[PDB]
Amino acid sequence: ISPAQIAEALQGRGWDAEIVTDASMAGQLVDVRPEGILKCVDGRGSDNTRMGGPKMPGGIYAIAHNRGVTSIEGLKQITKEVASKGHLPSVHGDHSSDMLGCGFFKLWVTGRFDDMGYPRPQFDADQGANAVKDAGGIIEMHHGSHTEKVVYINLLANKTLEPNENDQRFIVDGWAADKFGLDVPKFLIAAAATVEMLGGPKNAKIVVP
């Protein structure tokens, strides 16, 4: 899917979407490092000490969700898969709602993706986190409130954008979906629906090389 097809898809859902250059993001783009956790698109600050990893809705839950994987055993398999592909796997909570602090997982476990055809997880927030930890992953915990002002969809392979708790933005590394063989159109739409259902801004900037 091209940047224009992504913009069209978002516009069809009522979003504002614009394509921007990698040059316009100079000073913010960073190379992905193996030590970094593959984590959520959440724009808040957190206890993360493993920066430089890719961003996907709910961390590795984006992969399980896209694939319709709902079992704890399946979640652990994905944890190890992510760890085998250059990133430390993570999921997260926050210090306001504990493990229900991940908006994406909260939407999933409460059935908000029912009509988009997704099966519900066969575990709750604490069980999922414990399984990820048991399989070698990291649990991140965010702090503060959501104040994201925009959604950046980064298409530059092996690069990412980092959270700025004081001028927040949702960050989605679209290129990472391709890396994990996901149904990309499906993945980006799920990301769009997530922001929509969280009441976030339907305003995207698509970063291209």
Side-chain angles (χ1 to χ4, degrees):
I1 190 174
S2 73
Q5 281 176 288
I6 291 170
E8 181 182 62
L10 297 173
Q11 291 164 342
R13 297 180 68 86
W15 290 54
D16 278 67
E18 70 167 311
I19 298 177
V20 306
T21 63
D22 60 340
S24 73
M25 303 303 292
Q28 297 188 64
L29 284 156
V30 307
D31 292 289
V32 165
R33 57 201 283 272
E35 296 83 4
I37 54 168
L38 180 162
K39 55 165 277 168
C40 193
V41 304
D42 194 311
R44 293 174 298 171
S46 71
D47 66 5
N48 186 27
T49 59
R50 304 175 172 79
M51 313 289 296
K55 313 301 187 301
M56 302 186 326
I60 69 172
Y61 285 139
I63 295 162
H65 176 258
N66 186 264
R67 294 180 180 164
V69 171
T70 63
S71 65
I72 284 293
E73 175 190 2
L75 181 59
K76 289 183 175 183
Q77 182 177 51
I78 289 169
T79 299
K80 295 189 181 302
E81 175 190 359
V82 172
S84 81
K85 296 181 179 179
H87 314 294
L88 288 180
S90 82
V91 293
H92 85 93
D94 68 20
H95 291 294
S96 292
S97 304
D98 286 330
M99 303 315 295
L100 280 168
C102 172
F104 179 80
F105 186 74
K106 186 179 180 189
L107 290 171
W108 192 20
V109 79
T110 58
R112 293 299 298 288
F113 286 103
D114 278 352
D115 301 304
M116 287 178 76
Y118 293 89
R120 289 188 199 187
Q122 299 179 71
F123 54 87
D124 61 29
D126 289 329
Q127 292 170 320
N130 289 325
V132 171
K133 183 168 175 52
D134 290 341
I138 299 296
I139 304 304
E140 172 179 33
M141 296 297 279
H142 293 67
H143 61 79
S145 302
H146 288 284
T147 62
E148 299 91 349
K149 300 186 196 171
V150 67
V151 175
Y152 282 102
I153 300 178
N154 174 39
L155 303 183
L156 278 84
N158 309 310
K159 300 287 191 172
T160 191
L161 296 160
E162 304 286 47
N164 177 352
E165 67 195 293
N166 296 141
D167 187 0
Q168 298 185 15
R169 65 284 190 82
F170 283 118
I171 298 294
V172 183
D173 283 313
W175 62 269
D178 285 309
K179 177 167 185 180
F180 285 91
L182 305 191
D183 180 326
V184 183
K186 185 183 178 179
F187 167 94
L188 291 177
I189 291 179
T194 298
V195 174
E196 287 161 21
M197 296 189 287
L198 293 175
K202 297 166 66 177
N203 195 353
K205 287 188 180 187
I206 300 156
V207 191
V208 65

